[PDB]
Design an enzyme around this catalytic site. Structure first.
Site, PDB file in Angstrom:
ATOM      1  CG  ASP A 147      10.556  -8.522  -7.476  1.00 13.61           C
ATOM      2  OD1 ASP A 147       9.879  -8.465  -6.693  1.00 13.61           O
ATOM      3  OD2 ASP A 147      10.797  -8.243  -8.626  1.00 13.61           O
TER       4      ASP A 147
ATOM      5  N   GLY B  54       1.085  -1.230   0.053  1.00  9.72           N
ATOM      6  CA  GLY B  54       0.139  -0.264   0.079  1.00  9.72           C
ATOM      7  C   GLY B  54       1.527   1.172  -0.340  1.00  9.72           C
TER       8      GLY B  54
ATOM      9  CB  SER C  78       5.528  -3.577   0.073  1.00  5.61           C
ATOM     10  OG  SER C  78       5.587  -4.475  -0.830  1.00  5.61           O
ATOM     11  CG  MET C  79       3.557  -0.133   3.034  1.00  7.74           C
ATOM     12  SD  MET C  79       5.808   0.788   3.621  1.00  7.74           S
ATOM     13  CE  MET C  79       4.829   0.817   5.261  1.00  7.74           C
TER      14      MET C  79
ATOM     15  CG  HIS D 113      11.353  -6.110  -3.829  1.00  8.03           C
ATOM     16  ND1 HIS D 113      12.586  -5.959  -3.835  1.00  8.03           N
ATOM     17  CD2 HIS D 113      10.339  -6.410  -4.351  1.00  8.03           C
ATOM     18  CE1 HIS D 113      11.955  -5.489  -5.230  1.00  8.03           C
ATOM     19  NE2 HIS D 113      11.403  -5.833  -5.290  1.00  8.03           N
TER      20      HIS D 113
END
Ligand SMILES: N#Cc1cccc(CN2CCC3=C(C2)C(=O)N(Cc2ccc(Cl)cc2)C2=NCCN23)c1
Ligand SMILES: N#Cc1cccc(CN2CCC3=C(C2)C(=O)N(Cc2ccc(Cl)cc2)C2=NCCN23)c1
Ligand SMILES: N#Cc1cccc(CN2CCC3=C(C2)C(=O)N(Cc2ccc(Cl)cc2)C2=NCCN23)c1
Ligand SMILES: N#Cc1cccc(CN2CCC3=C(C2)C(=O)N(Cc2ccc(Cl)cc2)C2=NCCN23)c1
Ligand SMILES: N#Cc1cccc(CN2CCC3=C(C2)C(=O)N(Cc2ccc(Cl)cc2)C2=NCCN23)c1
Ligand SMILES: N#Cc1cccc(CN2CCC3=C(C2)C(=O)N(Cc2ccc(Cl)cc2)C2=NCCN23)c1
Ligand SMILES: N#Cc1cccc(CN2CCC3=C(C2)C(=O)N(Cc2ccc(Cl)cc2)C2=NCCN23)c1
Ligand SMILES: N#Cc1cccc(CN2CCC3=C(C2)C(=O)N(Cc2ccc(Cl)cc2)C2=NCCN23)c1
Ligand SMILES: N#Cc1cccc(CN2CCC3=C(C2)C(=O)N(Cc2ccc(Cl)cc2)C2=NCCN23)c1
Lengths: 176, 175, 176, 171, 173, 177, 177, 174, 176
Positions: C154, C62, C91-92, C116
């Site tokens: 990644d 996000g 992520s977040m 990542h």
């Protein structure tokens, strides 16, 4: 995403505002806005036709005949109408703003006021509507026709202070 | 979808209002300003001494919509605690710094921007920028000169630089 | 259409989840999700600031500054927060997951975890990316350079590598 | 839209009072959170009484489906899966994850384990081994037998899918 | 749109007359089909004279770039690959497939071998094809190539040249 | 845009390809791909009933009837046709690949070849069309119906080398002989 | 909008229908039509394992799997089910029509009934599904496979009276007995 | 849309190319860059001594598309006269500053901007540093001067830009 | 659907117009318009830099910096420039119109002329551009700054006759 308040009954805050006899004129004015506003103004008269009504304007303007609908209902009800400008009152918004009870026309300090008219009917009709705007503004600003129409030609906003001096409002307030 | 809490029951947002908490979330337009001003006014109707808390997580918005909040904040009597969460940029940082002095706060990891990012005439835009210059100088104790060169840098500040510049008073990790 | 469940009161199932002191962070993260999770977190802390909160993360990431508002409200409040990764936390989402109380960070067995990261000046993006390094460094107890390295790949982790890396404490299959 | 039955429920709520959890149509994150909610809610109500998952789905987001799988495997209750119409791709995974002897379909259903056709390529193969593994577990077939079948773009009838190990009872 | 030069050609017909073949922006079947045509035409004109392939691309469809890569291997001419701007994903595999010693970049290019409806086994299979192609032309080991393509990042012309993607970095003749 | 090349005479590169008796089957095959391909098979035959034509195929498939139109033109004309697979040939693409002159069907090394058919008419009509593909593939690969029918049920690609061992093509070439 | 009616108690007209053990199959049948219909077949059975249910069908068809889900629920539950055709029942609509309790399948006079199937999956899978429809229709009409298979190949509608003579329904009624 | 002039008959853009005039008009993308680079390679094959004239009226564009042009300008041997008309902003001003020293020009009313307006945050910062260094190189300013400058969301006048190192002359007429 | 004329060569009528040394400024002015116009003006100078150039304006205005591009090229070339207004010249259109060679600025009788500026950059920048417009108009109308900016505030068109009297054009013609 409208919040509810209790008072014991429980209303959403906008129903609550109308209980305090506050009617919002928030945003572009079209027929169903005008319908809402007219409905509210006539319901408050039915509650008490001597008790004042505060109408809060944040409007860029709108459909001219819808605005005159509100204006006409303003002129009709028996109540004093304090008008208050926050953010801006441009085009028909400041027409409603300038149309409050004399002595009860207010802006906050950083409001922006426009009487110039941002630019499907016949040509003479638009001129007719535009004279209507010219006389209503003359009536409530106690300015002359030629002064009003010169003014309405300047593509430009005023400060709450210039608008007071011009006859659009009476008091510019920071605090109660 | 918004959950209910609980003796009667309000949705959580209605319950934030019972705490005297006004959220200013996301981009600021006139109808958001309508919602915020109504709450401010109503909260002042409830006590005009008890503080009000303004949770600001906003990227900015319509200048005059934001001014209508700034003005309304100034109008009411209450002490106003302002809180920055995530970020307050453009109009939203004007609001954040307009809370009553010693009562402007950021959570630690926020970003704060006074740069205005970017239908009217160029003399009117400039009039509006001037109004921002003056509000900002009034509440950060900075000079107009300091306010303009700073608003000219397309950059964010940490809550500490914010507190130093005069946007904030406190930064905190917990109560 | 959200189901209802049942003196005797009647809840939609998601409120019921919040009665259990559970907050969900399902799907992508923006300011409005963050408003919702902060509202729930500050409310749960007000009903008991020592009773644990359980936060359920199934999320692909996000808005960063919106994600950080959640993280900071986690760190603010007084309650133990036990996090749970179901589906994924990239992520977040993985940063909220990693920012539960030490030893109360969980995943179910099949979850996929990513640290990542998939308009602002280039210096602000690096400022922000460094805040992410500092947070992951903190709670995973890993060195800055090791975080920056890891975040360049990644790929996803298994709940057992992310346990091993610092991101969570226990992988559970059935309730203890 | 949705009728009301008699205290009054809507029918989908009345079903939940029956310990029934629909899995209907494509599986995404919000299907999963709605399903996991109900599963937890039901186990809180009783951890011994069986839950019923009615599945009619062509699949969905693998991770969202994995989330429901795990929740199933976490909760203590016996779980009766029910295939209706079809359970394909992720749908067939959950169907096959009902607790043993309790996996049913109705006669005219269709069951697919072929996974119909943005993340990295290694991370896509990792996800596929997960399902390869999950399937081998609940059908007691080998991995070589799972992958082969998973490559044939085809449905099985309830009786084929019963012999394979996806379900136990067809009626 | 496209200007006309005399010597009467459009400027891009005139690049082809100079034995220059542009590979601009994203690769797809259409681009690949075009490129390959010019490559076979050029060989047909002469199988000894070099062909200058000018690449500035963020990548594209794997199969299509592989059609180009294969055509390059097929034809006899020395091919001088030139990176201007950027060569990412497939764009940089063609960069690496220039004739050894005539793989070039300009100073400010960016080079990326990290890669951004088919089945998992098939996506892995194509990825191993890329692995082996990159390993062959960089002379780097398989395991060195895979670590690499995992790091989502660009190399400067000189890190691309120490890796075996290209050979020379020219500021001017 | 399509460059122009000089020969004395000016051709756009694609026109000058046809001059080499090269016909390109690039992309999804619909009725007008087929129409343009058939236009040039018929044309090239009228320039020479016996000189070989080259189909360059890079295609993910297409309309089955439009594909079978090309297959049938290919069968009609007297020319030996060399097929070449570049990039890919999936579904009807690979059927046009398999249908070159025995021993004239080629792939470059890195091509991917698929015979599985990825997923308005009645049901009997689709099985009609499927069967026609079974018999075409059966014919030129020299495989049995039974073997074609299950290979095509495997949603997967073959390397040029497995495709050569299955029958789809005859040679996998790296450089010109 | 859906009116409310009073009963003492308030129902929207559709809710008050379910109170009569009436279930409506109106319009294209997808998975959530099926889900809502199955929800009420299962519900109505739990209010009474033997009281008859009424399906009002006015539908042009729908997803075959979603239709077969309903057919199968209909077969499962113990209730006698009266079907009623109103306006039309085409494709899977008419299959739900035919699958009521023998002798409880009805049409109003002016209804149109179609069993032909108007025009992502493989080919074998559609013929799989077609065959399943053949056997369902064969079962309840009491017609042979051969007869079902060709009737369904005729793109046409039957009157309630021909549908009764074919087997789809049992009575064509004008007024209440 | 585009007119024909006679001399033999070119379209008016083809005729500007015969003047050795290369137009960089509007937003710079890889395709603009393909066209511009083509022209510069060609015009050098005509002569590597005769000056090229790059007319720039551009708001900016893709950075790698921009640096490809810049690198092609460094590559070729020709003196390059850059001219600025309307504006040169972001990548555009970078090209303007990169013409041959003493040969960078602006019309009296042009506006010049060096302020900049899917990839990781370490790439952007790598790209930005690259702009920092081209710019520092070509304006004879330091890195520190350049970095702080690009942070001000502002346009300069042609005289301002001249004082800063972006250009050499400002001409009302010839 | 552009017609061809013979003259023996054969041009489309717009190529033909440029042969007569006529450049059209027709419609909204953007960068590629400006590019076309600038290209034409510099090609005509190359033909003869003392022979006049007629530029025909029917423009509602446009992108301000694109217009100054044309304006600047006008100021640069060596040729006299007769400007002619037909239909209208509003905003930058009348700026170009007012910027012809003195004595050679023309309108037809029913043309409509606007110097008011019909209303993504910083605030001070727009004011900067707007002063540029203020000085250019002052230069060529021989009016004062304060007169020009008052004028530019009137949201309003002039008749070819008022515009002449104001300094925007020199002759209003019906016939040759
Ligand atoms: N649009 C318009 C418009 C604007 C201004 C004036 C009028 C004239 N009408 C005539 C009829 C009329 C009027 C005024 C009226 O105010 N009340 C009293 C009332 C109204 C609303 C409410 Cl909620 C409660 C009490 C009333 N009660 C029944 C009939 N009636 C119309
Ligand atoms: N937009 C705007 C704006 C912003 C700031 C200040 C003002 C000025 N007005 C004057 C009228 C006015 C004001 C303030 C006022 O606060 N209350 C009290 C109140 C308000 C809401 C609720 Cl829910 C309950 C009680 C009030 N009740 C009757 C008259 N009145 C307007
Ligand atoms: N956005 C943001 C954000 C995130 C983290 C921390 C803070 C700081 N604020 C300070 C003011 C403040 C806070 C926290 C607070 O938790 N309660 C208690 C409370 C709040 C909500 C509910 Cl529903 C029930 C009880 C409170 N009651 C009045 C003022 N107030 C803000
Ligand atoms: N997504 C996910 C996921 C999937 C499987 C397992 C878990 C782990 N959690 C631990 C916390 C936790 C769990 C399970 C739990 O079942 N109940 C009981 C409960 C839940 C819902 C309702 Cl409506 C009523 C009662 C509970 N009550 C307080 C905290 N809590 C998470
Ligand atoms: N797609 C694909 C692809 C990619 C790489 C290699 C090949 C193999 N083909 C075989 C047929 C073939 C080849 C190479 C060939 O180069 N010329 C000469 C030629 C080609 C084009 C032009 Cl414009 C002028 C002359 C030729 N002339 C007639 C048949 N023929 C195919
Ligand atoms: N669609 C289809 C399709 C595909 C394959 C075969 C056929 C059958 N036709 C029969 C008539 C027919 C055929 C083949 C034919 O090849 N030529 C010679 C010819 C054709 C085109 C060109 Cl450009 C030059 C020479 C011919 N010339 C007059 C009549 N005629 C049709
Ligand atoms: N989709 C599907 C589908 C279609 C047809 C048949 C079935 C099989 N299930 C098995 C489990 C099962 C069934 C039937 C069942 O009818 N009731 C009784 C019940 C159901 C709903 C309501 Cl509202 C009220 C009472 C039940 N109560 C607990 C477990 N259970 C599934
Ligand atoms: N994108 C890019 C880019 C930018 C700068 C430098 C280079 C390097 N290449 C090397 C090969 C190469 C170059 C420059 C070259 O200028 N001419 C001469 C030429 C070019 C075009 C035209 Cl129209 C006419 C004559 C040439 N003719 C054959 C080989 N060749 C590439
Ligand atoms: N945009 C812009 C802009 C606007 C006004 C003035 C200038 C300055 N340039 C400098 C270079 C330059 C100029 C003027 C020039 O007019 N001719 C002569 C010429 C031009 C075009 C044609 Cl079609 C035929 C002959 C010339 N021939 C080669 C180099 N050159 C640029």
């Amino acid at each position: 995403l409208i919040p509810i308040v209790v008072e014991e009954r429980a209303y959403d805050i906008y129903s609550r505002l109308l209980r305090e006899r506050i009617v919002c004129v928030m945003g572009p004015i079209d027929d169903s806005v005008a319908s809402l506003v007219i409905a509210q103004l006539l319901f408050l008269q039915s509650e008490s036709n001597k008790k004042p009504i505060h109408m809060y304007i944040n409007s860029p303007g709108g459909v001219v005949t819808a605005g005159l609908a509100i204006y006409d209902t303003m002129q009709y009800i028996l109540n004093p109408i304090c008008t208050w400008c926050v953010g801006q009152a441009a085009s028909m918004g400041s027409l409603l703003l300038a149309a409050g009870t004399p002595g009860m026309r207010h802006s906050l300090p950083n409001s922006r006021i426009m009487i110039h008219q941002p630019s499907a009917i016949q040509a003479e009709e638009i001129m007719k509507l535009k004279k209507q705007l010219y006389n209503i503004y003359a009536k409530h600003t106690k300015q002359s026709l030629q002064v009003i129409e010169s003014a309405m030609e300047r593509d430009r906003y005023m400060s709450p202070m210039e608008a007071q001096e011009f006859g659009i409002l009476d008091k510019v307030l920071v605090h109660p």
